[PDB]
């Protein structure tokens, strides 16, 4: 261990960076999309469109 403290790192002996990397990639993308579109489907918290919210107005 080149000036390490824990063995945390041994995880990558066990796990495989490539699997983790590629999955995180997808996982995050999906959550990201979820939130984005989710938000943009409301009334408050839609940028991209006129305030349909009719916030109290009517």
């Amino acid at each position: 261990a080149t000036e390490y403290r824990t063995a945390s790192w041994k995880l990558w002996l066990i796990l495989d960076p490539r699997r983790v990397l590629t999955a995180l990639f997808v996982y995050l993308t999906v959550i990201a999309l979820l939130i984005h579109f989710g938000l943009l489907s409301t009334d408050r918290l839609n940028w991209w469109e006129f305030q349909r919210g009719l916030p109290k107005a009517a």
Binding site: Y4, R5, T6, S8, W9
Partner: peptide, 24 residues
């Protein structure tokens, strides 16, 4: 404007720190 409501800051922030420090 983030006033009285640090909720997301806490949720985002706290882990950010202990993720920093635990895995060195």
């Amino acid at each position: 404007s983030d006033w009285n409501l640090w909720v997301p800051l806490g949720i985002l922030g706290i882990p950010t720190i202990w993720i920093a420090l635990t895995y060195r």
